[PDB]
Amino acid sequence: XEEXX
Amino acid sequence: XXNXX
Amino acid sequence: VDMPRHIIVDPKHRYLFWADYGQKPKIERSFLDCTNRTVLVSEGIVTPRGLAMDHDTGYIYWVDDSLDLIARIHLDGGESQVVRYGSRYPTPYGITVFGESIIWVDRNLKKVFQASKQPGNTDPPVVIRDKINLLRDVTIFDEHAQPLSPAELNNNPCLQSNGGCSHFCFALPELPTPRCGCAFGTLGNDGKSCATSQEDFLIYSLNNSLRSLHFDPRDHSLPFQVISVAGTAIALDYDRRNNRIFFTQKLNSLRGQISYVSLYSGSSSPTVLLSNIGVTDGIAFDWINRRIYYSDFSNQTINSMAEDGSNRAVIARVSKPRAIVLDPCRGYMYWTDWGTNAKIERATLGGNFRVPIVNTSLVWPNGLALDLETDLLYWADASLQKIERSTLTGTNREVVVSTAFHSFGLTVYGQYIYWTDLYTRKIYRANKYDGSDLVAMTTRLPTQPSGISTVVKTQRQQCSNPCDQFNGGCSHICAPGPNGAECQCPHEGNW
Amino acid sequence: XXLXXX
Amino acid sequence: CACDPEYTLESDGRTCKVTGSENPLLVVASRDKIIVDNITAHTHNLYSLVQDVSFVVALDFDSVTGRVFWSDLLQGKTWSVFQNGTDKRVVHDSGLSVTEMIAVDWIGRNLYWTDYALETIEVSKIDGSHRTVLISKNVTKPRGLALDPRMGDNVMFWSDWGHHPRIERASMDGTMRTVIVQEKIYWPCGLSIDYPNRLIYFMDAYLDYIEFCDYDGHNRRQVIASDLVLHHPHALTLFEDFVYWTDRGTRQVMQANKWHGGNQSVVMYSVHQPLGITAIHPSRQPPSRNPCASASCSHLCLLSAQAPRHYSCACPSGWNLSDDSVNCVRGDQPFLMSVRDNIIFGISLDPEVKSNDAMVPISGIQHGYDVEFDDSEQFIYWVENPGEIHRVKTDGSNRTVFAPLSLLGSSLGLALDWVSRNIYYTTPASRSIEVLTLKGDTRYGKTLIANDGTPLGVGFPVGIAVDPARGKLYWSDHGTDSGVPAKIASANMDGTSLKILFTGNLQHLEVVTLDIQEQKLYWAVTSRGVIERGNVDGTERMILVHHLAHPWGLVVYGSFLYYSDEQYEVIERVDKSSGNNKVVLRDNVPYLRGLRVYHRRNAADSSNGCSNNPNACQQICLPVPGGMFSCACASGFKLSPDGRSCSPYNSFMVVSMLPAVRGFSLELSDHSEAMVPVAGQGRNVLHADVDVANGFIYWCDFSSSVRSSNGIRRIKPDGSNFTNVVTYGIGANGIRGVALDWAAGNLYFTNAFVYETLIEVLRINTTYRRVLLKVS
Amino acid sequence: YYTTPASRSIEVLTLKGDTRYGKTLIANDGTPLGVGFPVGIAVDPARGKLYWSDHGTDSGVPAKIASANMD
Ligand SMILES: *[C@@H]1O[C@H](CO)[C@@H](O[C@@H]2O[C@H](CO)[C@@H](O[C@@H]3O[C@H](CO[C@H]4O[C@H](CO)[C@@H](O)[C@H](O)[C@@H]4O)[C@@H](O)[C@H](O[C@H]4O[C@H](CO)[C@@H](O)[C@H](O)[C@@H]4O)[C@@H]3O)[C@H](O)[C@H]2NC(C)=O)[C@H](O)[C@H]1NC(C)=O
Ligand SMILES: *[C@@H]1O[C@H](CO)[C@@H](O[C@@H]2O[C@H](CO)[C@@H](O[C@@H]3O[C@H](CO[C@H]4O[C@H](CO)[C@@H](O)[C@H](O)[C@@H]4O)[C@@H](O)[C@H](O[C@H]4O[C@H](CO)[C@@H](O)[C@H](O)[C@@H]4O)[C@@H]3O)[C@H](O)[C@H]2NC(C)=O)[C@H](O)[C@H]1NC(C)=O
Ligand SMILES: *[C@@H]1O[C@H](CO)[C@@H](O[C@@H]2O[C@H](CO)[C@@H](O[C@@H]3O[C@H](CO)[C@@H](O)[C@H](O)[C@@H]3O)[C@H](O)[C@H]2NC(C)=O)[C@H](O)[C@H]1NC(C)=O
Ligand SMILES: *[C@@H]1O[C@H](CO)[C@@H](O[C@@H]2O[C@H](CO)[C@@H](O)[C@H](O)[C@H]2NC(C)=O)[C@H](O)[C@H]1NC(C)=O
Ligand SMILES: *[C@@H]1O[C@H](CO)[C@@H](O[C@@H]2O[C@H](CO)[C@@H](O)[C@H](O)[C@H]2NC(C)=O)[C@H](O)[C@H]1NC(C)=O
Ligand SMILES: *[C@@H]1O[C@H](CO)[C@@H](O[C@@H]2O[C@H](CO)[C@@H](O)[C@H](O)[C@H]2NC(C)=O)[C@H](O)[C@H]1NC(C)=O
Ligand SMILES: *[C@@H]1O[C@H](CO)[C@@H](O[C@@H]2O[C@H](CO)[C@@H](O)[C@H](O)[C@H]2NC(C)=O)[C@H](O)[C@H]1NC(C)=O
Ligand SMILES: *[C@@H]1O[C@H](CO)[C@@H](O[C@@H]2O[C@H](CO)[C@@H](O)[C@H](O)[C@H]2NC(C)=O)[C@H](O)[C@H]1NC(C)=O
Ligand SMILES: *[C@@H]1O[C@H](CO)[C@@H](O[C@@H]2O[C@H](CO)[C@@H](O)[C@H](O)[C@H]2NC(C)=O)[C@H](O)[C@H]1NC(C)=O
Ligand SMILES: *[C@@H]1O[C@H](CO)[C@@H](O)[C@H](O)[C@H]1NC(C)=O
Ligand SMILES: *[C@@H]1O[C@H](CO)[C@@H](O)[C@H](O)[C@H]1NC(C)=O
Ligand SMILES: *[C@@H]1O[C@H](CO)[C@@H](O)[C@H](O)[C@H]1NC(C)=O
Ligand SMILES: [Ca+2]
Ligand SMILES: [Ca+2]
Ligand code: NI
């Protein structure tokens, strides 16, 4: 539940 | 497929 | 071989032009009925996308994306004049002529151009609009481009009351009288009215309909206008004396039905004979004894009825019956079984002395046809994909068409055998002796052609019926036989 | 089937 | 009745059978498999000839070596193998593209084929040594092909399904070309020859028939016609009173009697469409004397129907047949290399020649934009999408991937420095201009110019032109938002002195090019549809051509300028001083791209520092104006104080992006990549940390969906010794932070579980791992 | 007034009454004076003037600030 491409 | 009208 | 793609019509000169961009590209000119085909351009043309006409000068303009060429030619023929060509005309796709200027669209450049129609002009074209995606065509909407006065149309017929023609009015280049065309049936002696063919033709069943087709492959006129019916029409046979077609119907999963429809000018709704009967896969009419024979598949019975309905009787029990054919003048009746063992069976028309005629190499013998003119039996097996012929004894078995596809209807008339194919959705024909002249009678139909019959205006074999005399001595039902009239009892109980 | 082999 | 020596009359007195033995085989091409059918007595035995096939199309065999030849459509190659399955080796490794059919000349030892995309008929030796285009004149869609090499006939047949379909006959050297069948065909598909009776069998897929006819086209008969058995026949071969054909519509191989078309039966069914078929037997290839056994022809020696010699000498693409008519010389004249999507062609500079056979075509390109060449060694260079540069010789040999260009994106432009042996290219993805060395056995590459914020950096470079003497790069540039303007720019070839030459109404700027002799730049602007000129001084500027649609490529050679318009689908020649004499070279050519002229330029006519002083620099040499040279080093290395040797980049900074990890120097004047970039598949970087003493860079990957893409990795700044550091026990959210203790050798990191978070330690080069804190 | 970059036109629509009436004012002819790719539009009801910003095209029409009467 965080930042990815 | 099947032999029907 | 030809593929006409873009077609234009000229009511003034009374000609029909079209472009062809397949193998052997060309521009063709023809009458309004497509009967005097001539080629205008056939050299230095590849992929003519579109063509247009200026009526006041009588030139045909066309565009070649494969040659980057815009050219024009007179109606009467001669030499092609190059209007515009070169690198700066990559893909002209559509053209039109208005007054002194031509207007065309270019697919690559996404522009609609306007330039002088006269060849050898060197003025750069003006752009009407730009950045239009996927341009295909351009046409002029003007009264000047579609003249209506008789003087401006060279006294064209069909301007008043359709020239008196019932269906179609085709003018001819220099004649003062129009050639009336017929959508269905044949043109009468009156020369402007249409009636039924009054000749021999095929009939076939299709979804919701009974449809008609001429024997001549080069005659495209319908012998009669399509008859519309409720439910799928599965099988049909023709009654000469009353000029009506007896045909069967399929409703729901199991609700079969039998009806008849008249081919006279009345053309009323089809009159029902039975309802609530099982699915019926074939039907035959006895012209001598005036009884109808039909097969019920869902109920494993072949049964007989009078032409009025009335008395009904079982003729045989059969594992999977399809087609039936009758030979009343010799008292014999044939039918096909595609059950656990597939076989063709023969009995008297009373249903007695049942014997199998051919009971080897058969899997789905759907179709059956008997030829009285040569005394041979024909059948079409859908699993083996073959049409075969034999003597009525089944001795001289021969293939007549190998790879027949998924045969269902079969009939024979003159020198040819006609069959319906459920796989390709076409009717084919072939020579009845050796299958040589094989052509497709129909294009790929929109749904499966379910059964086929002839319509014959001449009486068939007219042997004397022994059953009329005191009902042939029987108490209820009687049918002709090899020796004498054979009695049957109704199915309403035990007899 | 369309004639082109690709 | 009588028959040829290969046959014997039977007791019937009118039927002949083969001499005996050899058990004739029938070989069929299905997409994945070459099926062999061994015709043992009356039955059939099916098995695969070869294990490693992608899409087989054509088949033929050689009776003298016992080899089976095939074309693979997806690989773009011709192969052969022995009939027993051993010694698989390549015949043509490049330059085929939808090769339709093959025919082996067992007497002349030659190999003929038809090609659909090239629209040619080509011939080569049975080893594929020498290649030329035999017939291209009126050829549109050649498919079927057959030969009669027996002395006295020496004719070839082919079928064309173009706009005017026909079957043509010609001598096997392509001289006496004539049309034999043009009357009742729509889709001619597959040909075969009955050698004993001298009949040619052909088929049609639209009219659905099989017919045979004599060599002159007269006595034609129908074998199978008006028969629903034929759906879409493709290839045909006959043997002993039978025809075997492949039908693509019904996907099965059929047999029938070759005279009356009866006795029809299936030989085999196929899951895929069966395309080619051939019957392997000595009967299928009768022996004859070889007229060219004693010939002195260099290169190809082709059999011919000419009575005296029955042979003619021919020579590959790019050679002239000398006046001796036995020897051939190299055609050193220039030719225009027309880059297109999916193929690069070599066309003659003469507009009257429409052959496209100046070089062996380079098929199988993807997203083709630009090209370069090195006349020495005769190599052609183009870039491939995945970030590679490929090479091939003008004769189709030595096609290999030369070197990897960039790990950060795909390159667009190309330019070759032919005296220092360097290649300059643009990579608009990473927005840099870099160089790569052609000399030596080891590849070295340096980013020369990068996108800093200033007007002088590259914004989005499209084209490159190099001037070996006077040592300047020129490039065309679309600019960037809030930085670099759309411009024509120049630099020293070492990247030192950035300069803006022209800026103005350039919006859809295309490739730049240079006329070295006149020292003027040329470029095209799509937004205005013009081609412009300009001095390299940046002073004089003018419009040369008007009213273009979408110029893509342009090149200046001699007194003429050649440009290709992608929207007009044309290649045109104009004078380089003005438009004036417009001449069209090619038209109706789709997918046009950049252009280049292959011509003789030598290291003698122009020299610079890097040519005068080889071995001065240990890695890269870059010339600069005034005849001097600058040494340089590959990515990850810095030039030593000696100005000649290379050393690892001791001081730089690390920036981490989600796609990659990259290093930049502290001194802003150095645009080179100070570290070999960590990129490629499986990279999703959150943070990076460094280990200066031991020379390592630690980073943590992240992946929400795919596991094993989570963890900590290490790598040296030179790109060596990649190793996973932490892999086990990563939380649902990955390692969210990394910190290295350079004194104690401890590595701190954070695990991010869904409702928990750990701080952990790991001793480097050691399995000891501990949790320090757990928080919620 | 509104711009339709999909159709390369500047159009008008009527607010008064229960029946809507719409017209296209300027389209993309070959000339630079036409509409290339309209982004913004500002109208001056008095003095009867209409102003728009154009991205231009790969054609005669350049990137420009253009003006026209509201007819
Ligand atoms: C292999 O075979 C090919 C084809 O037969 C030969 O190629 C020809 O070679 C000759 C000799 O080099 C070329 O002739 C030269 O062409 C140059 C370019 O000319 C352009 O303009 C002319 C029209 O004026 C066109 O015909 C031509 O296609 C070009 O567009 C000229 O600049 C050269 O001129 C120089 O020499 C002449 C003659 O002495 C002088 O008068 C001039 O002042 C000048 O010094 C020259 O004419 C010819 O163009 C080539 N043809 C092709 C198709 O490219 C190969 O030479 C041959 N190779 C071998 C070794 O056998
Ligand atoms: C975990 O394990 C890894 C190996 O898997 C270790 O990695 C090695 O770390 C050592 C650290 O010393 C590295 O050794 C260093 O290499 C440098 C590069 O050498 C090149 O250049 C020198 C000239 O400067 C040449 O002599 C040499 O041939 C090479 O061309 C050297 O510059 C370093 O020199 C230092 O140590 C030497 C020896 O004591 C002294 O003489 C010098 O003055 C100087 O202090 C040094 O030799 C080694 O390269 C690493 N190998 C790998 C595979 O990367 C990690 O260190 C270890 N992890 C931890 C945290 O300990
Ligand atoms: C599969 O079939 C091929 C074709 O028959 C076999 O190739 C042949 O193999 C033999 C034995 O190795 C070769 O014999 C040698 O011939 C040379 C003369 O050319 C002679 O000097 C040697 O002493 C030897 O006799 C033969 O040349 C070769 N055929 C060809 C055309 O090259 C192959 O061996 C078979 N595969 C297997 C696994 O058996
Ligand atoms: C084929 O025949 C069936 C009925 O036998 C047609 O079915 C009707 O379709 C229309 C809509 O097109 C419905 O409103 C009717 O209620 C349907 N009738 C029944 C009995 O279901 C069908 O349209 C025909 N299709 C074609 C292509 O001929
Ligand atoms: C297929 O039909 C043939 C037709 O003759 C059947 O052969 C007859 O079989 C009966 C019963 O065995 C014999 O009494 C006849 O003498 C046979 N006729 C001849 C002339 O052979 C045959 O039995 C049928 N096959 C099947 C499986 O029913
Ligand atoms: C095709 O099959 C035949 C056999 O049906 C092969 O010929 C025989 O192969 C066996 C293999 O052990 C040998 O022992 C025999 O001596 C062969 N000859 C004969 C006459 O039986 C034949 O080799 C096969 N064809 C190919 C080339 O695969
Ligand atoms: C290629 O095709 C063209 C067009 O059919 C041929 O040109 C024709 O040649 C014949 C003589 O063979 C002349 O009668 C025609 O007038 C020519 N037509 C035109 C428009 O030029 C040409 O000969 C063929 N060339 C080759 C090499 O086959
Ligand atoms: C197919 O092959 C068979 C042999 O396997 C041929 O057999 C002959 O067929 C005719 C048909 O009228 C018979 O009269 C002959 O007696 C048969 N001869 C023999 C020796 O069996 C047959 O001719 C071939 N098919 C065609 C269409 O000709
Ligand atoms: C181009 O490829 C050929 C092979 O097709 C190379 O020639 C071989 O080079 C190796 C080098 O060790 C020799 O051992 C072989 O004897 C050569 N001949 C063959 C037929 O393999 C050639 O070196 C390549 N050229 C370049 C510049 O890469
Ligand atoms: C039309 O076709 C007929 C029949 O082929 C022909 O005789 C006639 O000359 C043609 N043209 C005219 C003027 O009817
Ligand atoms: C089959 O015959 C039965 C009587 O035996 C009859 O009730 C039924 O209608 C027929 N077929 C159907 C529709 O099941
Ligand atoms: C590191 O890289 C060198 C050179 O690639 C290699 O020889 C060596 O085995 C590697 N060592 C380790 C521990 O990865
Ligand atoms: Ca075109
Ligand atoms: Ca077909
Ligand atoms: Ni562009």
PDB file of N, CA, C and O in Angstrom, chain E residues 504-523:
ATOM      1  N   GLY E 504      14.703  29.508 -34.162  1.00  0.00           N
ATOM      2  CA  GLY E 504      13.681  30.289 -34.842  1.00  0.00           C
ATOM      3  C   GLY E 504      12.397  29.494 -35.046  1.00  0.00           C
ATOM      4  O   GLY E 504      11.792  29.043 -34.080  1.00  0.00           O
ATOM      5  N   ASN E 505      12.001  29.289 -36.311  1.00  0.00           N
ATOM      6  CA  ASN E 505      10.704  28.710 -36.632  1.00  0.00           C
ATOM      7  C   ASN E 505      10.772  27.184 -36.704  1.00  0.00           C
ATOM      8  O   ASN E 505       9.870  26.563 -37.265  1.00  0.00           O
ATOM      9  N   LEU E 506      11.853  26.596 -36.175  1.00  0.00           N
ATOM     10  CA  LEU E 506      12.019  25.158 -36.044  1.00  0.00           C
ATOM     11  C   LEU E 506      11.005  24.659 -35.014  1.00  0.00           C
ATOM     12  O   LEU E 506      11.107  25.025 -33.843  1.00  0.00           O
ATOM     13  N   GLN E 507      10.013  23.855 -35.433  1.00  0.00           N
ATOM     14  CA  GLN E 507       9.194  23.122 -34.478  1.00  0.00           C
ATOM     15  C   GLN E 507       9.344  21.619 -34.685  1.00  0.00           C
ATOM     16  O   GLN E 507       9.916  20.951 -33.827  1.00  0.00           O
ATOM     17  N   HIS E 508       8.856  21.086 -35.808  1.00  0.00           N
ATOM     18  CA  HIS E 508       8.972  19.655 -36.066  1.00  0.00           C
ATOM     19  C   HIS E 508      10.260  19.398 -36.845  1.00  0.00           C
ATOM     20  O   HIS E 508      10.242  18.924 -37.974  1.00  0.00           O
ATOM     21  N   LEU E 509      11.391  19.728 -36.228  1.00  0.00           N
ATOM     22  CA  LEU E 509      12.695  19.617 -36.848  1.00  0.00           C
ATOM     23  C   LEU E 509      13.049  18.149 -37.085  1.00  0.00           C
ATOM     24  O   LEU E 509      12.809  17.299 -36.244  1.00  0.00           O
ATOM     25  N   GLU E 510      13.594  17.866 -38.272  1.00  0.00           N
ATOM     26  CA  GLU E 510      14.002  16.535 -38.686  1.00  0.00           C
ATOM     27  C   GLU E 510      15.526  16.450 -38.626  1.00  0.00           C
ATOM     28  O   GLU E 510      16.185  17.339 -38.083  1.00  0.00           O
ATOM     29  N   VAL E 511      16.071  15.358 -39.164  1.00  0.00           N
ATOM     30  CA  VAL E 511      17.492  15.083 -39.061  1.00  0.00           C
ATOM     31  C   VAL E 511      18.268  16.208 -39.739  1.00  0.00           C
ATOM     32  O   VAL E 511      17.782  16.843 -40.673  1.00  0.00           O
ATOM     33  N   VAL E 512      19.486  16.455 -39.236  1.00  0.00           N
ATOM     34  CA  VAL E 512      20.447  17.371 -39.845  1.00  0.00           C
ATOM     35  C   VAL E 512      21.439  16.562 -40.683  1.00  0.00           C
ATOM     36  O   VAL E 512      21.610  15.361 -40.478  1.00  0.00           O
ATOM     37  N   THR E 513      22.077  17.219 -41.649  1.00  0.00           N
ATOM     38  CA  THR E 513      23.118  16.605 -42.453  1.00  0.00           C
ATOM     39  C   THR E 513      24.097  17.690 -42.877  1.00  0.00           C
ATOM     40  O   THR E 513      23.771  18.877 -42.874  1.00  0.00           O
ATOM     41  N   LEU E 514      25.302  17.256 -43.249  1.00  0.00           N
ATOM     42  CA  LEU E 514      26.399  18.167 -43.533  1.00  0.00           C
ATOM     43  C   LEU E 514      26.991  17.838 -44.898  1.00  0.00           C
ATOM     44  O   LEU E 514      27.248  16.679 -45.210  1.00  0.00           O
ATOM     45  N   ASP E 515      27.223  18.889 -45.692  1.00  0.00           N
ATOM     46  CA  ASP E 515      28.030  18.795 -46.895  1.00  0.00           C
ATOM     47  C   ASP E 515      29.438  19.265 -46.542  1.00  0.00           C
ATOM     48  O   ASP E 515      29.691  20.468 -46.469  1.00  0.00           O
ATOM     49  N   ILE E 516      30.350  18.308 -46.347  1.00  0.00           N
ATOM     50  CA  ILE E 516      31.689  18.611 -45.866  1.00  0.00           C
ATOM     51  C   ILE E 516      32.449  19.454 -46.891  1.00  0.00           C
ATOM     52  O   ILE E 516      33.166  20.375 -46.515  1.00  0.00           O
ATOM     53  N   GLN E 517      32.292  19.153 -48.184  1.00  0.00           N
ATOM     54  CA  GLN E 517      33.048  19.844 -49.222  1.00  0.00           C
ATOM     55  C   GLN E 517      32.698  21.335 -49.247  1.00  0.00           C
ATOM     56  O   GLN E 517      33.582  22.175 -49.405  1.00  0.00           O
ATOM     57  N   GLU E 518      31.411  21.664 -49.090  1.00  0.00           N
ATOM     58  CA  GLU E 518      30.962  23.053 -49.142  1.00  0.00           C
ATOM     59  C   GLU E 518      30.795  23.656 -47.742  1.00  0.00           C
ATOM     60  O   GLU E 518      30.632  24.870 -47.621  1.00  0.00           O
ATOM     61  N   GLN E 519      30.823  22.817 -46.697  1.00  0.00           N
ATOM     62  CA  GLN E 519      30.720  23.242 -45.304  1.00  0.00           C
ATOM     63  C   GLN E 519      29.410  23.997 -45.074  1.00  0.00           C
ATOM     64  O   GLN E 519      29.412  25.120 -44.568  1.00  0.00           O
ATOM     65  N   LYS E 520      28.287  23.352 -45.421  1.00  0.00           N
ATOM     66  CA  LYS E 520      26.963  23.900 -45.155  1.00  0.00           C
ATOM     67  C   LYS E 520      26.078  22.806 -44.567  1.00  0.00           C
ATOM     68  O   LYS E 520      26.096  21.675 -45.029  1.00  0.00           O
ATOM     69  N   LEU E 521      25.346  23.114 -43.491  1.00  0.00           N
ATOM     70  CA  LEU E 521      24.360  22.217 -42.903  1.00  0.00           C
ATOM     71  C   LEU E 521      23.050  22.270 -43.681  1.00  0.00           C
ATOM     72  O   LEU E 521      22.663  23.328 -44.171  1.00  0.00           O
ATOM     73  N   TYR E 522      22.348  21.132 -43.728  1.00  0.00           N
ATOM     74  CA  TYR E 522      21.019  21.020 -44.308  1.00  0.00           C
ATOM     75  C   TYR E 522      20.099  20.378 -43.277  1.00  0.00           C
ATOM     76  O   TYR E 522      20.509  19.484 -42.544  1.00  0.00           O
ATOM     77  N   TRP E 523      18.846  20.826 -43.217  1.00  0.00           N
ATOM     78  CA  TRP E 523      17.866  20.217 -42.329  1.00  0.00           C
ATOM     79  C   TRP E 523      16.474  20.470 -42.880  1.00  0.00           C
ATOM     80  O   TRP E 523      16.285  21.307 -43.751  1.00  0.00           O
TER      81      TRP E 523
END
